[PDB]
Design a protein around this ligand. Sequence first.
Ligand SMILES: [Ca+2]
Ligand SMILES: [Ca+2]
Ligand SMILES: [Cl-]
Length: 238
Amino acid sequence: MKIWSKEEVVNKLHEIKNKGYLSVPTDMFRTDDGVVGQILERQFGVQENNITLGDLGEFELKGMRNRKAKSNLTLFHKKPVAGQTVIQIFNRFGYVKPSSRNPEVMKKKLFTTIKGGRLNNLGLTLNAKHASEINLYYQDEYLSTWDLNLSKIEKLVLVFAETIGRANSPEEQFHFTKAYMLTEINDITSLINDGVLVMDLCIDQDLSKSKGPHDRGPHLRIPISKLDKLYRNIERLL
DNA sequence: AACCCGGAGAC
DNA sequence: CTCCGGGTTGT
Ligand SMILES: [Ca+2]
Ligand SMILES: [Ca+2]
Ligand SMILES: [Cl-]
């Protein structure tokens, strides 16, 4: 694994911007929201996930399309350590509905954003006692507990891309034009409790093709507009 | 299995 | 806010 110096990241970010719009290789294309991230990784020579460390060594690398209305940033994924499993939560709270991409395919889905301070429409909420005890409740009923390790996101390099071409098409292209270094991470108990940090469940199942469920892992996420509540220091790199 | 890479529109 | 995907890695 290469450990990128801060200066090497800055230099590389300028080189990347200077390349203009980058294309999706034919063999990479898979009708995939995440392709912006795959393209950005390739530019940093990131060849596989590393279990211990952020992608760049000291920093975790994240790419995002610069949408006017911007989806949350996914920080990382983690299964609950105790209580109900994600498949058990899916069994109970999932709902049957056509695929949003392909209306002719019937799915069972649980795509839900769960947060502290409020019950969502499915009755789900979070509370945290410590960072290693984040609990999922359905109403006043305890379900599960997460023990989250924040180590990999202590420092981020977040890079925004402009796009041309249809979203998730083979012709989609990406110009990385802005980037930020985020550091001095805050304790997350209050951020969970106050609904700044959220947890998305992203499980579905292709019933039409008689397939098993696909649990994409509980996603810890945060709106881009609230990054200043998670990190005390945000520095423009590009 | 349990992580990885990320999205949309309504009001 | 409700609601939404594509993968590989580890057993
Ligand atoms: Ca990674
Ligand atoms: Ca990354
Ligand atoms: Cl689980």
